[PDB]
């Protein structure tokens, strides 16, 4: 079994972020010029996809996390990783 | 065992498709910032992929769907979807 | 099971797309600079791919995230050939 892996950025840097489903969870490496880290991203999920878009200088991310069929979106919107309204009936 | 998802967005709205693989077909659903809505999009398919770009307002989207070792093109430019030219091999 | 994945990126507005398969352990590369499609020079082992691009004026740079088992590498076009990107899961 390989981890799945969705990837996103912005700017020209650039940002970067890849998110990894391994096993059930979702975790996030970040690249903002410097060297590669860990960050904040952390949610249970066996499939994920990115987008995002900026607002002038400020990054919004929307990662679509799914377990069976039940697909969460978290929201990135500048302070921390919320739930989003995104529902579907899978 | 999970639904696979592909995830675009564009300019700051913003609006935002995510199309869903499940059970061999795909879905997709809408935000154009008031709700999520079902799209127009109804393809086969086990596994999904998605870009878009902007030519001034106007939005395109190419959607990748395969099955077994076939992958097939759709295209969205303003006016329905439509079979892209996209081909692979075998 | 049995079927391929694929990941896709685009730039401009000609466009320009490059779609990535992953099809039984090897990933190969198809694209789009508005004159039909053709193969291109990516070709890189793994089970998975995820690729993502940006622009730099009419410059494109592109990052395909490969990974098999745990094992996910990142694959660097920036005008020159591919080459292989500092990305690790760990430091
Ligand atoms: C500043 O925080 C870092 O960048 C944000 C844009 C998010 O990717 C977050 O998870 C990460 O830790
Ligand atoms: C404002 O609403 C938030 O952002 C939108 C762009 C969507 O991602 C929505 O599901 C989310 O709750
Ligand atoms: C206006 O139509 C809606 O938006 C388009 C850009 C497509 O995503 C279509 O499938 C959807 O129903
Ligand atoms: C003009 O051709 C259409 O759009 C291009 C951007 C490609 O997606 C191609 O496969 C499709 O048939
Ligand atoms: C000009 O070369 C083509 O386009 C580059 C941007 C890369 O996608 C490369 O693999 C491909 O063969
Ligand atoms: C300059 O460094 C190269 O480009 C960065 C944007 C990252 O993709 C990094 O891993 C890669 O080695």
Same mark, same amino acid.
């Given at each position: 079994?390989?981890?799945?892996?969705?990837?996103?950025?912005?700017?020209?840097?650039?940002?970067?972020?890849?998110? /990894?489903? *391994? *096993?059930?969870?979702?975790?996030?490496?970040?690249?903002?010029?410097?060297?590669?880290? /860990?960050?904040?991203?952390?949610?249970? %999920?066996? *499939?994920?996809?990115?987008?995002?878009?900026?607002? %002038?200088?400020?990054?919004?991310?929307?990662?679509?996390?799914? /377990?069976?069929?039940?697909?969460?979106?978290?929201?990135?919107?500048?302070?921390?990783?919320?739930?989003?309204?995104?529902?579907? /009936?899978?």
């Amino acid at each position: 079994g390989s981890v799945q892996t969705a990837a996103t950025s912005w700017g020209t840097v650039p940002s970067i972020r890849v998110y /990894t489903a *391994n *096993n059930g969870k979702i975790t996030e490496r970040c690249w903002d010029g410097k060297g590669w880290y /860990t960050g904040a991203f952390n949610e249970p %999920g066996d *499939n994920v996809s990115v987008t995002s878009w900026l607002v %002038g200088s400020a990054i919004h991310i929307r990662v679509y996390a799914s /377990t069976g069929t039940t697909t969460t979106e978290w929201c990135w919107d500048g302070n921390g990783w919320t739930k989003g309204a995104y529902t579907a /009936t899978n």
